[PDB]
From Swiss-Prot, chain A:
The chain holds residues 254 to 542 of 545 of the full protein. This is Serine/threonine-protein kinase PAK 1. Homodimer; homodimerization results in autoinhibition. Active as monomer. Interacts with GIT1. Component of cytoplasmic complexes, which also contains PXN, ARHGEF7 and GIT1. Interacts with NISCH. Interacts with DVL1; mediates the formation of a DVL1, MUSK and PAK1 ternary complex involved in AChR clustering. Binds to the caspase-cleaved p110 isoform of CDC2L1 and CDC2L2, p110C, but not the full-length proteins. Interacts with ARHGEF7. Interacts tightly with GTP-bound but not GDP-bound CDC42/P21 and RAC1. Interacts with SCRIB. Interacts with PDPK1. Interacts (via kinase domain) with RAF1. Keywords: Acetylation, Allosteric enzyme, Apoptosis, ATP-binding, Cell junction, Cell membrane, Cell projection, Chromosome, Cytoplasm, Cytoskeleton, Disease variant, Epilepsy, Exocytosis, Intellectual disability, Kinase, Membrane, Nucleotide-binding, Nucleus, Phosphoprotein, Serine/threonine-protein kinase, Transferase. The keyword Transferase applies. It comes from Homo sapiens. ATP binds at residues 42, 85-87. Residues 17-255 form the Protein kinase domain. It comes from the Eukaryota. Protein kinase involved in intracellular signaling pathways downstream of integrins and receptor-type kinases that plays an important role in cytoskeleton dynamics, in cell adhesion, migration, proliferation, apoptosis, mitosis, and in vesicle-mediated transport processes. Can directly phosphorylate BAD and protects cells against apoptosis. Activated by interaction with CDC42 and RAC1. Functions as a GTPase effector that links the Rho-related GTPases CDC42 and RAC1 to the JNK MAP kinase pathway. Phosphorylates and activates MAP2K1, and thereby mediates activation of downstream MAP kinases. It is an enzyme of class 2 (transferase). GO terms for biological process: actin cytoskeleton organization; apoptotic process; branching morphogenesis of an epithelial tube; cell migration; cellular response to insulin stimulus; cellular response to starvation; cerebellum development; chromatin remodeling. Autophosphorylated in trans, meaning that in a dimer, one kinase molecule phosphorylates the other one. Phosphorylated by JAK2 in response to PRL; this increases PAK1 kinase activity.
UniProtKB/Swiss-Prot annotation, chain B:
Homodimer; homodimerization results in autoinhibition. Active as monomer. Interacts with GIT1. Component of cytoplasmic complexes, which also contains PXN, ARHGEF7 and GIT1. Interacts with NISCH. Interacts with DVL1; mediates the formation of a DVL1, MUSK and PAK1 ternary complex involved in AChR clustering. Binds to the caspase-cleaved p110 isoform of CDC2L1 and CDC2L2, p110C, but not the full-length proteins. Interacts with ARHGEF7. Interacts tightly with GTP-bound but not GDP-bound CDC42/P21 and RAC1. Interacts with SCRIB. Interacts with PDPK1. Interacts (via kinase domain) with RAF1. The chain holds residues 249 to 541 of 545 of the full protein. One of its GO terms (biological process) is positive regulation of protein targeting to membrane. It comes from the Eukaryota. It is an enzyme of class 2 (transferase). Autophosphorylated in trans, meaning that in a dimer, one kinase molecule phosphorylates the other one. Phosphorylated by JAK2 in response to PRL; this increases PAK1 kinase activity. GO terms for molecular function: ATP binding; collagen binding; gamma-tubulin binding; identical protein binding; protein kinase activity; protein kinase binding; protein serine kinase activity; protein serine/threonine kinase activity. The active site is at residue 129. It comes from Homo sapiens (Human). Activated by binding small G proteins. This is Serine/threonine-protein kinase PAK 1. It catalyses: L-seryl-[protein] + ATP = O-phospho-L-seryl-[protein] + ADP + H(+); L-threonyl-[protein] + ATP = O-phospho-L-threonyl-[protein] + ADP + H(+). It is linked to Intellectual developmental disorder with macrocephaly, seizures, and speech delay: An autosomal dominant neurodevelopmental disorder characterized by impaired intellectual development, poor speech, postnatal macrocephaly, and seizures.
């Protein structure tokens, strides 16, 4: 608990933040009273402690501009408050479902996600859940990853479809950083198709297809540019050794058609207007 | 309309105060999903356990298919953003993994489950997820079936399904291979549950879920590790549950008449197993 006292901040967070709106514990949106910065606050009743504290410690040291970044934490009575930056642009999922992203906007998102993965993979972190729900957007078009850990019963039934998982993860083989690269390729296909790859398809059937067919089938490849399809083929190489690393793919030609991140801002406005 | 499906779910349940009908709320062993508790009917003292398209189907299925061999749904409440009967003896998984049941004890459990399946199948409800984990036991030794989240309702106009739903290790061959299938996939899954009672585990549990599916598609009827330890009559009952030929596989009605079930012990014989399982926990 003395290390818990080494991470918590001095202050009453009820005084430093206002406009608490509710949206492993509850999640509020709030606003820094002194600067007006929007924040997201997660509240957790401590009474698997030791993991929570270790994670807080590694978050605060390994900041990165393409990761939803920790701000502070507070010991509030019996519960721990963890304060993150709030990204008000919403999730990539909303953008993907309400707009048709062009390849330039896709390349931009892919570059930003690959920068995050290079950072994480250099510190030996595996995200394991690279997918559109876990990509948050800022109102200036920033792109940041969320919902992963810095630090699954065979008897249980599958809910729902794990469409983002690499073949080596579905076969429950030990796996490494390249599973994120597979997931990113799936997400790029989702962006251009407007839907996750496996709908109308049962989870166990999807599991078998991921394991057997592997490199996912896309509708009408002739819709894609040759360089986008090459990029997808580098990401979705069933052979792990051949599959590109984050560092290698940051060099890929497809990323050089990326539009400025401001090009994402009209997509955000369109998504917000549609919901509702 | 992804909000019309929610609106339908709310309409199917009524608004009232649960805390004004049940008391003594206590967070029981919640798991993956969570929010499982125990309570006490204020008026009668009855002990209860309280926890979108699929949720709707399951609630509906439960309300219209009540039976002594099914964990009875008691009431539903809507407050802001499911009462069931409580079976203090725990799951059959705790028994099969921590104890060695004898043939009389196995036959008794199989009969109660076959009684459950005869009732569902005659009401055209296929469970599709039979396994020891969905068998709950009373402190008097009663055996009840739960979890209708995967169940299919069939008709004479559509009597078959083709969907890979269930839990791999227990799935029938015709489900794994996406052939049209009917109520007898539950019979197969009961036979796998009998193997659980014999060996402690369904076949291939050491394999991975996907490897296990391929092995079911390619082996068909699984092999007991030690068949010679079973009476020929138990061996026979098992063989009619795990028949590859759906036509030759026994129905719930036909298997309730099997001779293996004649050696069943009374349900009181299961309470020593429950005590062993609790102790083993
Ligand atoms: C266990 C210690 C690790 C840190 O623990 C947290 C992780 C993430 C978040 C979060 C950030 C966030 C930022 N921006 C937006 N904008 C929509 N939302 C956010 N959310 C809501 C769900 C995001 N999928 C969060 O939960 C929060 C509040 C806490
Ligand atoms: C999502 C669809 C609605 C679900 O509707 C329910 C289904 C099952 C149960 C349940 C009963 C129960 C009875 N008795 C005991 N004995 C301890 N436990 C029970 N549990 C705990 C897990 C059992 N595997 C339950 O979840 C409950 C409480 C609700």
């Amino acid at each position: 608990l003395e290390k818990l006292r080494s991470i918590v901040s001095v202050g009453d967070p009820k005084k430093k933040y206002t406009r608490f709106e509710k949206i492993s514990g509850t999640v509020y949106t709030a606003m820094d009273v002194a600067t007006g910065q929007e924040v997201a606050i997660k509240q957790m009743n401590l009474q698997k402690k030791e993991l929570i504290i270790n994670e807080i410690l590694v978050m605060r040291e390994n900041k990165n501009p393409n990761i939803v970044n920790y701000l502070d934490s507070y010991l509030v009575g019996d519960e721990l408050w963890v304060v993150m930056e709030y990204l008000a642009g919403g999730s990539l999922t909303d953008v993907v479902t309400e707009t048709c992203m062009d390849e330039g906007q896709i390349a931009a998102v892919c570059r930003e996600c690959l920068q995050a993965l290079e950072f994480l993979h250099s510190n030996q972190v595996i995200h394991r859940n690279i997918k559109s729900d876990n990509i948050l957007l800022g109102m200036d078009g920033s792109v940041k990853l969320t919902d992963f850990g810095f630090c699954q019963s065979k008897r249980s039934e599958m809910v729902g479809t794990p469409y983002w998982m690499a073949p080596e993860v579905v076969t429950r083989k030990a796996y490494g950083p390249k599973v994120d690269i597979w997931s990113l390729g799936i997400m790029a296909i989702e962006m251009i198709e407007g839907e996750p790859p496996y709908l109308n398809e049962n989870p166990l059937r999807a599991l078998y297809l991921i394991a057997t067919n592997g490199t996912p089938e896309l509708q009408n490849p002739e819709k894609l540019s040759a360089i986008f399809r090459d990029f997808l083929n580098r990401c979705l190489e069933m052979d792990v050794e051949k599959r590109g690393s984050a560092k290698e793919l940051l060099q890929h030609q497809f990323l050089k058609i990326a539009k400025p991140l401001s090009s994402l801002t009209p997509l955000i406005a369109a998504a917000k207007e549609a919901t509702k």
